[PDB]
């Protein structure tokens, strides 16, 4: 159970925003210019790491 739980938690943390505009990377890439999108992607990368 614990193992399964861990995996689920990991997957669930893909949906979290970590203070970014949205969890989806494509949405950030489309909406924001690359210089502004870099900061959001950096926040998401830090959270996922």
């Amino acid at each position: 159970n614990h193992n399964a739980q861990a995996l689920n938690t990991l997957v669930k943390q893909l949906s979290s925003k970590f203070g970014a505009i949205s969890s989806v990377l494509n949405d950030i890439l489309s909406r924001l210019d690359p210089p502004e999108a870099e900061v959001q992607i950096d926040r998401l990368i830090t959270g996922r790491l």
Binding site: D33, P34, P35, E36
Partner: protein
């Protein structure tokens, strides 16, 4: 990271540009009562530069 007519169709500073932008007024030299039609810019193009 700035988008505009000049930025996209005339001259684009790279995303990771290193340097200084130097600008100064040139109304005395580049302006004539008849009109300085010599200078041109582009406002129509197929794709961004």
């Amino acid at each position: 990271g700035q988008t505009g007519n000049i930025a996209d169709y005339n001259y684009k500073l790279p995303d990771d540009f290193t340097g200084c932008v130097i600008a100064w007024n040139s109304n005395k030299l580049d302006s004539k009562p008849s009109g300085n039609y010599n200078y041109l810019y582009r406002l129509l193009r197929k794709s961004k530069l």
